[PDB]
Amino acid sequence: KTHVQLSLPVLQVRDVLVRGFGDSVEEVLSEARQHLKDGTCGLVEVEKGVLPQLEQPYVFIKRSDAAPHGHVMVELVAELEGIQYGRSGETLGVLVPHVGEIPVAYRKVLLRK
């Protein structure tokens, strides 16, 4: 399927144990997509002071359209030293590995895969 319905656990930035997916734009997009498939991906909501507490390159989910079955359609955009790889809509949050942190909420998304 071109899209997959996922429910992403929303993590508090100070709980996150593994603060990024790797060391290059290509690796972090690769790893984010693998963790999304494996159900091992969390979402951190972006506010003042969040991104400097996480590791670049960043992987964002961004709204790709204006929401089947309650799931917002999203795609992946990476960012390294202020340059984004991809073009999409409003940020829903920054993706991180999930290694058993307790979430505060779930974000239902339809991920363009």
- Look up the CATH number of the domain holding residue 39: 2.30.30
Q: How far apart are CA 82 and CA 104, in angstroms?
A: 29
Q: How far apart are CA 71 and CA 19, in angstroms?
A: 25
Strands 72-80 and 105-112: parallel
Range of the domain at 59: 3-112
Q: Tokens for 94?
A: 């920054």
Tell me the technique behind this structure: X-ray
Total number of domains in the chain: 1
Return the biggest CA–CA distance within the chain. Answer: 36
Q: What is the stated resolution of the deposited model, in angstroms?
A: 1.6
Q: Are 51 and 45 in contact (CB under 8 A)?
A: no
Which residue type sits at 101? E
Q: How far apart are CA 103 and CA 15, in angstroms?
A: 9
